[PDB]
């Protein structure tokens, strides 16, 4: 059901943010809840994800480094970002994939400066 992202903003490289994401609707759908990200003049690509059948999985180079997690209520979902590089600057999205399709969030803009 409808996701409401929060918690974007600018940092300087080296930075710390944490992107966060409220929810409504099925916590007895789930299936996986991942961030992905929208690098302008790119499409989307996966950054984080936590599956219910498998652990958490990462990818992009934004391994060793940010961390996905999510709460006992499954009413919130957060994406730490640690050691930002300016490479990262982008609209991150989040999706929570259930049984009755994926829903997505509006996104929130991150800036990651030189």
């Amino acid at each position: 059901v409808q996701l409401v992202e929060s918690g974007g903003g600018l940092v300087q490289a080296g930075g710390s943010l944490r992107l966060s994401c409220a929810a409504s609707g099925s916590i007895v759908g789930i299936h996986s809840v991942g961030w992905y990200r929208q690098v302008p003049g790119r499409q989307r690509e996966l950054v984080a994800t936590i599956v219910t059948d498998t652990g958490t999985h990462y990818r992009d180079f934004v391994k060793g480094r940010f961390t996905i997690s999510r709460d006992i209520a499954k009413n919130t979902l957060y994406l730490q970002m640690n050691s930002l590089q300016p490479e990262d600057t982008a609209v991150y999205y989040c999706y929570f994939n259930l049984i009755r399709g994926r829903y997505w969030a509006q996104g929130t803009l991150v800036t990651v400066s030189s």
């Binding site: 299936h31 003049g41 690509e45 996966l46 994800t49 994939n97």
Partner: protein, 199 residues
Amino acid sequence: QLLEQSPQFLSIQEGENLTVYCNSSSVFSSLQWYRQEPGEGPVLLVTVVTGGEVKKLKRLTFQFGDARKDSSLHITAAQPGDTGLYLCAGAGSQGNLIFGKGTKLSVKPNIQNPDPAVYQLRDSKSSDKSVCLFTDFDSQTNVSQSKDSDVYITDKCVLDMRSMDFKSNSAVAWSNKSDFACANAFNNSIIPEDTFFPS
């Protein structure tokens, strides 16, 4: 007298720009260009004549060399329809046209809202092959062939299921009965780690 057209292949995503280029040593009068989508033959795209000339004919903009040496065919914002094998040509060595090897463009679509899943399809008729669908995922997933020889998996097509303006990558694999289930169909591909396999 040969034109070499380079790239040999290009991919690029929907809406981005690209460019191909076609070059030779020796000028030609004319240079012409054709898009040829498989089992229809090469449809003339435009014919350029004069030096540095540029036509634009829609998305395509095409530009001939100043000493008429090579020509470039840029398209601005590719679209699925822009898919196909772009061959250059030119005047022969008595009149017989001389083709470049021709750049296979492949534009892939911008799936936004990717939701990769494989699901199993199946019938209540007779056929004894049960084929599982891997769909909607994103256009950078490359769906590898199996190392069972009684899968078979298909290659990504995109669909254009207009009027919702949804385009959607697919492949199907099946394997000969074997006694195979879904999961393991695409155990050899690197698939997304959010692919919803269903119970």
